[PDB]
């Protein structure tokens, strides 16, 4: 199991050129696949670690290392919090070097999908200056089909810590879960021993007491597609890449385009938790040159808001655990969803819609407004009623159905939403309000009907 350690998704252009060369020359599939944990993967490796080491990159020792890539909000609205937040994600990543998932999140963006993760540090400021974190623990999405002893769970608030406690807290949580783990994921341990019990042990091990939670709110999980103004005279260009799959396609040489950008770009790239890529820290005067290459390579091809907010996992052909197609199904599925949105006069809207190929849940369908969970070839469980910000697990609505059945249901439901929604009301929230699906309030107890 070759995935790269790459805290916060930050990769240099020299690193990019090396992985570009390796993917094209030394793999079956020839692609770079951006993952939804802000790193990249090669598929069908035909010297890989040698390649990574040659540009300062390492791969996680999966044989024994159960930590995974540490995420950090890629493109925060307050651009000046990124540097310090990233520094901490990197320090946490390095601290955890010898499964367990960690993020650093900058409100109001939940792009990193904190509720899918064991441990989450929510940035708090005073003065455009990072001062501490709220800690939320116990998220995780994997289930086993029909097994009511498994469940997706959101993360629970433990409390606030000043920056000086970050690494000790990180170590206390990871060791407490490893130790108390049976069903051995943090989410199960937390439910078994109780939140207060786990929290008290983390406090003991880290030598701290958590302070009261400090105010935070999330407004969305999407990337900021296109150009955004950064700090000073810098600009960030986020490129939508369908499924994060970087390969040259007819009329759309995505891989060649990114290589050419890497050769002239003065800053770094950032891989996002939505499987997209940011050309980060472009000076204003270099925007036109970068945009020209991107546009000409198909990297800036316009898609609907819906497509920008849809995601799938890898699934077939490379995943040995796959039950139904996900990545390969998504583009045509979303063509069909775009048709439904247009049919109903909501083409400018979006529904956070995700497809995962089996119930392990890598595509993060169990935090979607509409989630499809693979059950068998061509068949998915349809879940409804998550929200845009990703703080609620969607209950199963229809089990083990095919694409035409899914499309007929969504036609009806999207049609109702378009006509009946309140101002700014998301599809997921609407399905709950209209009594189409019951919400999940306490997943360990009420996820399963
Ligand atoms: C690439 C990625 C999906 C994507 O399209 O982006 C992915 C791909 C796979 N995941 Fe994952 N997971 C990916 C994010 C996730 C996430 C979402 C997240 O972390 O944000 C989850 C759900 C959250 C969670 O962990 O609860 C996830 C939960 C799993 C699980 C279930 C673990 C569990 O708690 O039960 C497995 C199965 C296992 O470990 O036994 C798994 C196993 C796998 C494997 C390695 C299959 C395997 O064990 O042999 C997949 C390889 C497919 C392939 O051919 O590339 N992966 N996987 C993600 C890589 C992230 C990374 O860089 O590390
Ligand atoms: S959800 Fe299942 S099919 Fe999809 S990548 Fe993860 S393990 Fe493979
Ligand atoms: K994407």
UniProtKB/Swiss-Prot annotation:
Binds 1 siroheme per subunit. Binds 1 [4Fe-4S] cluster per subunit. Pathway: Sulfur metabolism; hydrogen sulfide biosynthesis; hydrogen sulfide from sulfite (NADPH route): step 1/1. GO terms for cellular component: sulfite reductase complex (NADPH). Its EC number is 1.8.1.2. GO terms for molecular function: 4 iron, 4 sulfur cluster binding; heme binding; metal ion binding; NADP binding; sulfite reductase (NADPH) activity. Siroheme binds at residue 362. The keyword Oxidoreductase applies. It catalyses: hydrogen sulfide + 3 NADP(+) + 3 H2O = sulfite + 3 NADPH + 4 H(+). The keyword Cytoplasm does not apply. It is an enzyme of class 1 (oxidoreductase). GO terms for biological process: cysteine biosynthetic process; hydrogen sulfide biosynthetic process; sulfate assimilation. InterPro entries: CysI, NiRdtase/SiRdtase_haem-b_fer, Nit/Sulf_reduc_fer-like_dom_sf, NO2/SO3_Rdtase_4Fe4S_dom, NO2/SO3_Rdtase_4Fe4S_prot, NO2/SO3_Rdtase_4Fe4S_sf, NO2/SO3_Rdtase_FeS/sirohaem_BS. Keywords: 4Fe-4S, Amino-acid biosynthesis, Cysteine biosynthesis, Heme, Iron, Iron-sulfur, Metal-binding, NADP, Oxidoreductase. Pfam families: NIR_SIR, NIR_SIR_ferr. Its cofactor is siroheme; [4Fe-4S] cluster. [4Fe-4S] cluster binds at residues 313, 319, 358, 362. Alpha(8)-beta(8). The alpha component is a flavoprotein, the beta component is a hemoprotein. Component of the sulfite reductase complex that catalyzes the 6-electron reduction of sulfite to sulfide. This is one of several activities required for the biosynthesis of L-cysteine from sulfate. Belongs to the nitrite and sulfite reductase 4Fe-4S domain family. This is Sulfite reductase [NADPH] hemoprotein beta-component. It comes from Escherichia coli (strain K12). The gene is cysI.
């Amino acid at each position: 199991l070759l995935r790269c350690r790459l805290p916060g998704g930050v990769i240099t252009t020299k690193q990019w050129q090396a992985i570009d060369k390796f993917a094209g020359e030394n793999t079956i599939y020839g692609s770079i696949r951006l993952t939804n944990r802000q790193t990249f993967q090669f598929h069908g490796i035909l010297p890989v670690h040698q390649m990574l080491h040659s540009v300062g990159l390492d791969a996680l020792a999966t044989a024994w290392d159960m930590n995974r890539n540490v995420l950090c909000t890629s493109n925060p609205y307050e651009s000046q919090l990124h540097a310090e937040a990233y520094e901490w994600a990197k320090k946490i990543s390095e601290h955890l070097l010898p499964k367990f998932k960690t993020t650093v999140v900058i409100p109001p963006q939940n792009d990193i999908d904190l509720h899918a993760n064991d441990m989450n540090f929510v940035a708090i400021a005073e003065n455009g200056k990072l001062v501490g974190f709220n800690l939320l623990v116990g998220g995780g999405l994997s289930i086993e089909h029909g097994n009511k002893k498994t469940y997706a769970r959101t993360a629970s608030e433990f409390g606030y810590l000043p920056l000086e406690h970050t690494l000790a807290v990180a170590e206390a949580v990871v060791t407490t879960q490893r130790d108390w783990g049976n069903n051995a994921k943090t989410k199960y341990t937390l439910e078994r021993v109780g939140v207060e019990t786990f929290k008290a042990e983390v406090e003991r091990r880290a030598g701290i007491k958590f302070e009261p939670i400090r105010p935070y709110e999330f407004t969305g999980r999407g990337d900021r597609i296109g150009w955004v103004k950064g700090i000073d005279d810098n600009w960030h260009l986020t490129l939508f890449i369908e499924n994060g799959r970087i390969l040259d396609y007819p009329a759309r040489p995505l891989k060649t385009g990114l290589l050419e950008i890497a050769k002239i770009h003065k800053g770094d790239f950032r891989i996002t938790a939505n499987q997209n890529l940011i050309i980060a820290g472009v000076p204003e005067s270099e925007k036109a040159k970068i945009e020209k290459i991107a546009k000409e390579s198909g990297l800036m091809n316009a898609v609907t808001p819906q497509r920008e907010n849809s995601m799938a996992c890898v699934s077939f052909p490379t995943c040995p655990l796959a039950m139904a197609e996900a990545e390969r199904f998504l583009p045509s599925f979303i063509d069909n969803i775009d048709n439904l949105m247009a049919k109903h006069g909501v083409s400018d809207e979006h529904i956070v819609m995700r497809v995962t190929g089996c119930p392990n849940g890598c595509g993060r369908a169990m935090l979607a407004e509409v989630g499809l969970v693979g059950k068998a070839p061509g068949r998915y469980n349809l879940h409804l009623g998550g929200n845009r910000i990703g703080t609620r697990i969607p209950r199963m609505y229809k089990e083990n159905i095919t694409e035409p059945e899914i499309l007929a249901s969504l036609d009806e439901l999207i049609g109702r939403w378009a006509k009946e929604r309140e101002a700014g009301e998301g599809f997921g929230d609407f399905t709950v309000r209209a009594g189409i699906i019951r919400p999940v309030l306490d997943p360990a107890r009420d996820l399963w009907d």
